[PDB]
Symmetry: D2
Subunit: 298 residues, 4 copies
């Protein structure tokens, strides 16, 4: 069976483990620095197996040795000061996990996402195609949900692409969204679409403001799990993910949210969209922001 | 539980029943005029339930009384003028007996000639046009999406497409209205290669017939039909191409034609009117002419 | 579409909502007394829909009016003093929800389970068959997981029945458990089986001891969701649930965990197992304990 | 991805391919000696992928070279001594060509006579006995579980059962080893009614043949076969009745017989030896005599 190790058994990590286990995608190892937590969450999930009908081992641990030979490593352990804290956490997680699973595809979820993925690439020394970050799938999912709700159509028929990072760094691309092949712009008028784009930008904060003490985890976990599935089943999904750029969109030496074909080899293709001047202005501004964070990290 | 009656226990009908059952979408009644066939296929499907894990009733019958009060009626009992005549007789017989027993059902036609038979079903049942539709576009778009996905090297889950008209020469391809995760298909496939894929889609049904030699496709056709049934039963509001009755859309009146619609609990909840360019209109008008001809023969 | 209202948007309630939504079982309404919480959890789940592919409305609210006309009402809002606190919470939830959904099946999850279900029956005034509690499905699930692990077989092939309540009130029935129709006792020897029975009794506490601050929710939610599904799809599942007894097992005027056939009408049959003297001694002791809790409630 | 080769693109084979594909269990290769049939069925199934949402390759072929390096080989190409002879020839041809190309595969036989053909497949392939099994018990138990569930008025998901031997007269019913959510089936069904259900199970295959008149069951048989394939590919360790090679179990030696096993990645990982009472042994011995006779004819 395939093996997936999830580093950080918090809300996102445990929820991700649940979806992966339910789909029988492989044995799951939940690791955390806090003793008892991962073991308890793993056992709780495991005990749901006779009810849900899945046969995969779900174990919790505090020892990185148990993550050896994983096919995929998901990192959901994150917390100017934010970069510092998360940078140390990421270096610690990757430096211990990477060596034990040399052929794994690493999927970063920790924030600041683009920068942390870049760091994981540096620390692991893995081929760039095998180190990616989850960000765009979640943001596109929120956009798709809003579009489906406004248009009054099935979420199964709404598809969309976007780039960059989260919040102000997000590069919306409404032009590159369709409903069963039909432009979204044919269903939703300009002003309403602009409102939906703005809601997408602030999507994470909207959940935080409602929860008061926590952040979103259901959609973030679903997005992460869909990426893991794409790798394990070599599905060649077309999705926006944080990938290492070598000239695409005029960008070099940087991890940025871009459309890719995701499969068993990780990023199997970075798609180059024919962005117009307005869209490129947005991308360039985002890249500048992402670049700043990266320079601070260095 | 919801109730679905499938008229015609052949390959498409029985395969459609299997998917609906596996998804526990509702109790299923398979009907056929041949004694023993539906009963045998229903029992076979039912005996698979402990393995597949579904709890829905699956029964075969030769009596229309068993289809009473169905939420959806699927017609897969079909067999140029001779073809139209034979199928017209089969369709009239099927609908004239089933419709009265399930007045609140949505009728989904599969019999060929599809558009014409859906029109006939509308007349015979007297049902509101929104509740009488035909499956054709979903299958055609499925073939197109399959070919595009394989050529572009991407998941079939990320390719979506719209098209209109009918099957074969009546098909109105609309590559401009197809995307891969929101990105235009034209950005992935070269024009010459795309034209080839469009042609393969037009001849998609025949391609299978020539391979089987003594049969026709049923897996994809059944999947398409089942997806439409699910759209209605679960009120999903799917955006898909289906044969619907037009009263002005695309310049067509009093005719069933494959068009983009929002499909849900009330059947067709909206007929979308896409802004077609001159070339696409030329294709559509030529197609409507062919559909009209079939419709006129039927009326004759 | 069917409508399911979940009262209490905590760990168990939100997790239950996730499974129900993923399976497209019906529109879900998450209600809670705390503002923002249910709305945030509902929106987070809803935004996962384009990824998971389900079309059902998931909304959060603080207003009981939004729960009107529900087909199923799940109560997961619970916290000698334990009976007091939970009793008031239960009376408040049911007295407000029951009147708005007169034809609903109520599934209680709050502890003390048997007593709270009895209370919900009193407050709602609903036919007894339509007011049940979730307890046995979770306990049997833990047992099945342990048996599957020890025997080295698929959890999909292990089935088991048990009765009573949780912990010391649980009435284990290893004799009534099989692996693909074969007695569990043929796979697992007496001493090891006794160990597994004891682990099942302490199953909830085992998770609490590992989590340190929280309790189990994945398996509890799965158990609850399986019961909701049984009702919505009229599956006639045979499972142990807290039901009102009118003479079965020699018990009257009490809610107790017993084997039932669960469907759209709620409890459609209470099965009467041919328990031997040893098993009946266990049941009688449990009933005495459950009876004591009930008397205190009164 | 895992790779599954299905030899014989008839009803059972094609239906089995559909389930495996829908569950994305691995790439599927459908092989048949008739040109065009497998290619047509494979393309039809493949074109359903955008609708059902699966990303696995489904191809049809007439060349065994395309089945190379398969994880599992399913044989559904079969057609008293005449029956044995014809099928023996088909099985030998199928196995002698496929086995060498997929040395690490688990072979799952479906051809009738099941036990005898599985024995033949073992000989021809030379594979370790644990990796050569036959599907028969899962289907028989499925029919039994279906009848029990309907009679008891409970979900098919909660009825489990074990049985041994072969099909029809060779079937060894074991009601004592069947439960409903852990509760003995005997507590739900009266003795006389249970005996009737056991009889219906024995004649289960024939019941379908008589209804169809010109065909045989394939939905339940395919479901049973697919569940076994899944058990191997996902190393689930399912406890199920399958035709396995005995070397002493139940007093039987050098013979394939339906017995309880734990099925996983290595094929048969354990043959369970149930403590049968005198009456059950009488049934088993009579069955083994019938299976032995078929085996001896084959060896002749
Ligand atoms: N849409 C997105 O891009 C998105 C959405 C949500 C959360 N996130 C990010 O994902 C991460 C996890 O979010 P969460 O809400 O699940 O957090 P959380 O606080 O619930 O869980 C993080 C877990 O990491 C563990 N941890 C810390 N240091 C560790 C180390 N060195 N090794 C192993 N485990 C360690 C903690 O003990 C904790 O259980 C955060 O960095 C957050 O910002 C991103
Ligand atoms: N993509 C498409 O548009 C598409 C795809 C497949 C099939 N079709 C059409 O669907 C129909 C069925 O195709 P099939 O391959 O399943 O055929 P089939 O011959 O396998 O089955 C048709 C079944 O209808 C039954 N039947 C005939 N007259 C009947 C009546 N009056 N009442 C009840 N049952 C009756 C037959 O006995 C037979 O079992 C055909 O008309 C075919 O052209 C269209
Ligand atoms: N296996 C079992 O039988 C089992 C397992 C776990 C939990 N439980 C029980 O289930 C209940 C929920 O457990 P949890 O861990 O999810 O708890 P929790 O504390 O996470 O969530 C309970 C939620 O109820 C809400 N609440 C309180 N009073 C309310 C009222 N009057 N109306 C509406 N909402 C109200 C809270 O604000 C909170 O969000 C508890 O009573 C617990 O003991 C039983
Ligand atoms: N429950 C059971 O035990 C059970 C259930 C169903 C079928 N079966 C058996 O399974 C076999 C298949 O049944 P079916 O209904 O699918 O039959 P079928 O006649 O529909 O299909 C068999 C296919 O095998 C092909 N074939 C023949 N010889 C071949 C060879 N040498 N190589 C490759 N392909 C070859 C044919 O051309 C045909 O397409 C039969 O032997 C039948 O008795 C057993
Ligand atoms: Cl960043
Ligand atoms: Cl109690
Ligand atoms: Na969850
Ligand atoms: Na099928």
């Amino acid at each position: 069976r395939k093996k997936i190790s999830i580093i950080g058994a918090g809300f996102v990590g445990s929820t991700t483990a649940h979806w992966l286990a339910a789909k029988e995608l492989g044995d799951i190892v939940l690791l955390d620095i806090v003793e008892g937590v991962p073991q308890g969450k793993a056992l709780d999930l495991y005990e749901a197996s006779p009810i849900e009908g899945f046969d995969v081992r779900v174990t919790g641990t505090n020892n990185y040795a148990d993550t050896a030979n994983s096919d995929v490593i998901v990192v959901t352990s994150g917390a100017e000061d934010l970069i510092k804290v998360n940078a140390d956490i990421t270096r610690a997680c990757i430096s211990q996990a990477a060596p034990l699973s040399p052929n794994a595809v690493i999927i970063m979820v920790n924030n600041p996402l683009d920068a942390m993925t870049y760091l994981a690439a540096e620390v692991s020394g893995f081929p760039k195609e095998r180190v990616i970050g989850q960000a765009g799938v979640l943001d596109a999912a929120r956009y798709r949900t809003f579009i489906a709700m406004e248009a009054g159509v099935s979420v199964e028929d709404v598809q969309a692409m976007l780039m960059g990072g989260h919040g102000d760094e997000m590069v919306p691309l409404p032009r590159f969204s369709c409903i069963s092949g039909i432009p979204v712009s044919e269903f939703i008028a300009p002003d309403r679409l602009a409102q939906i784009v703005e809601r997408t930008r602030k999507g994470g904060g909207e959940i935080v403001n409602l929860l008061k003490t926590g952040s979103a985890y259901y959609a973030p976990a679903a997005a992460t799990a869909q990426m893991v599935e794409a790798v394990l089943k070599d599905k060649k999904r077309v999705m926006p993910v944080a990938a290492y750029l070598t000239g695409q969109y005029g960008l070099n030496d940087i991890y940025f949210g871009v459309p890719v074909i995701l499969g068993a080899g990780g990023v199997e293709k970075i798609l180059e969209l024919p962005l117009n001047e307005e869209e490129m202005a947005l991308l360039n501004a985002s890249a500048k922001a992402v670049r700043a964070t990266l320079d601070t990290l260095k």
